[PDB]
Amino acid sequence: GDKAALADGHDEIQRTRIAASLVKIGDKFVAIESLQRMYNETQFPCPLNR
Amino acid sequence: EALLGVYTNVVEFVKFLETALAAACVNTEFKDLRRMIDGKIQFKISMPT
Numbered sequence: 611g612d613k614a615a616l617a618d619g620h621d622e623i624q625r626t627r628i629a630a631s632l633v634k635i636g637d638k639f640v641a642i643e644s645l646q647r648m649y650n651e652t653q654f655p656c657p658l659n660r
Numbered sequence: 661e662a663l664l665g666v667y668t669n670v671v672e673f674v675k676f677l678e679t680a681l682a683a684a685c686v687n688t689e690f691k692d693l694r695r696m697i698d699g700k701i702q703f704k705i706s707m708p709t
Contacts, residue, residue, distance in 0.1 A: 652709050 614621065631642050649656045676682060690696075 652707070654709075 633640050633642055645658075646656055677687065
């Protein structure tokens with residue numbers, strides 16, 4: 611019963627169709643994204659490169 | 661006495677649109693290119709931040 615009061619948002623938000631890559635690691639589904647496109651098109655250094 | 665000879669033909673080759681090299685270039689037939697002096701392409705690159 612507390613679950614409805616705990617999340618007003620993310621219940622009854624209209625769903626959609628998101629295009630992203632996925633992967634399967636054991637019992638868990640994980641999405642993979644590399645953001646060098648949003649950094650090298652603006653030519654700021656990327657924070658994943660340490 | 662009339663004499664005949666044997667001539668062998670020139671070995672023809674595959675034309676340029678029928679090779680696989682034209683997958684790397686974009687081919688147009690510009691009819692009067694001896695009239696062209698120069699030809700230019702101008703890019704305009706807007707850069708986000």
